[PDB]
Amino acid sequence: EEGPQVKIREASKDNVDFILSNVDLAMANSLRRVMIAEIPTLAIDSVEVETNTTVLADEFIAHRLGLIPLQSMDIEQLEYSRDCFCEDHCDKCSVVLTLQAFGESESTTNVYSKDLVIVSNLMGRNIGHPIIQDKEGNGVLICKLRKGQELKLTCVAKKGIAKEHAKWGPAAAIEFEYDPWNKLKHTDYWYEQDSAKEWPQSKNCEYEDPPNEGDPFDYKAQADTFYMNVESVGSIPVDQVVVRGIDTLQKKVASILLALTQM
Amino acid sequence: CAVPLQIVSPQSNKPCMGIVQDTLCGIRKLTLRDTFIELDQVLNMLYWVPDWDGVI
């Protein structure tokens, strides 16, 4: 296409690194901000406690359960509770799971995510599954239990946005870098004697010809090229994260257009 | 007791208030000889001035 051009350098399950060109600065910054903020996903929100004979306090366990990653491919197929006409919660707008265990042996028992049990009807939608990136598949460590203890509770997760609160954070780190050679003179490097030796070279520096000392400043240059690297939390495939962010930004713009038409 | 009516305190013929902390530091860099502002930047800055008359 004639719009922004893309060139991926590396691609894994956790992070995607690529180069975005033929685009202004504002658009790239907006993409970064959106991927961080408005990426609708699922997360535990409501915690009901039956019993807690554990060391830790209830609210502590609820808070921790809030941040366990969850499967959210079909999150778009799920509806926000704030819009669902059901009281409290419903399968069409929420996912219910439970956590039950109790001390059995004198040794500590490590209550993990994999012990979380899906209860409500998924309607076949690929959502609600706790995400385990562990080598042993043990998953996140929810808590610990002694022999003469017991912990049972019910959790309800709802679709929400990281902007509202962190627990919906889908993307951990976004490396974002442009004009590594500082051709645009957007920066004045601090130095003691000479920046040319007192500053390390960015790994991306090898993707452009080093600037020539004998050339005058290009005062008309635009901050065109960009280098980005998104590390997903595992809740969504990285490419899906990029696609969803792009779609969400375009949808905000479309909503502004629709509001203008209504005006 | 309205704030402006005490801008000049009769204690020492000096206005007690003034620019301090980061705002003071920023001014020196801004008005410095080696400072220049690009068009896009100016328009945004101008709109911050609540009393701007609308003239570039």
Binding site: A57, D58, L67, A166, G169 | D22
Partner: protein, 82 residues
């Protein structure tokens, strides 16, 4: 952050930074001596937190005593000290 004040990453707080439990305890005595003095707390007829533990005992004198411990969750707020 003009004066000594500070900017704190909001999302970082939500991920746990500087979260703090806060336990407080209340105690009360059922009544004074048994010398024709009477009072109790059996739900007579007509701060923020939750009940964590309720402990009932008695002094060496046989007067019943009650201790209540309640707990809450401090979530960093603008204006706190650091």
């Amino acid at each position: 952050n003009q004066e000594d004040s500070m900017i704190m990453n909001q999302s970082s707080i939500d991920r746990g930074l500087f979260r703090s439990l806060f336990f407080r305890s209340y105690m009360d005595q059922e009544k004074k001596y048994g010398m024709s003095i009477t009072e109790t707390f059996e739900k007579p007829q007509r701060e923020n937190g939750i009940v964590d533990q309720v402990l009932v005992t008695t002094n060496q004198d046989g007067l019943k005593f009650v201790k209540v411990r309640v707990r809450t969750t401090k979530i960093p707020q603008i204006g706190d000290k650091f």
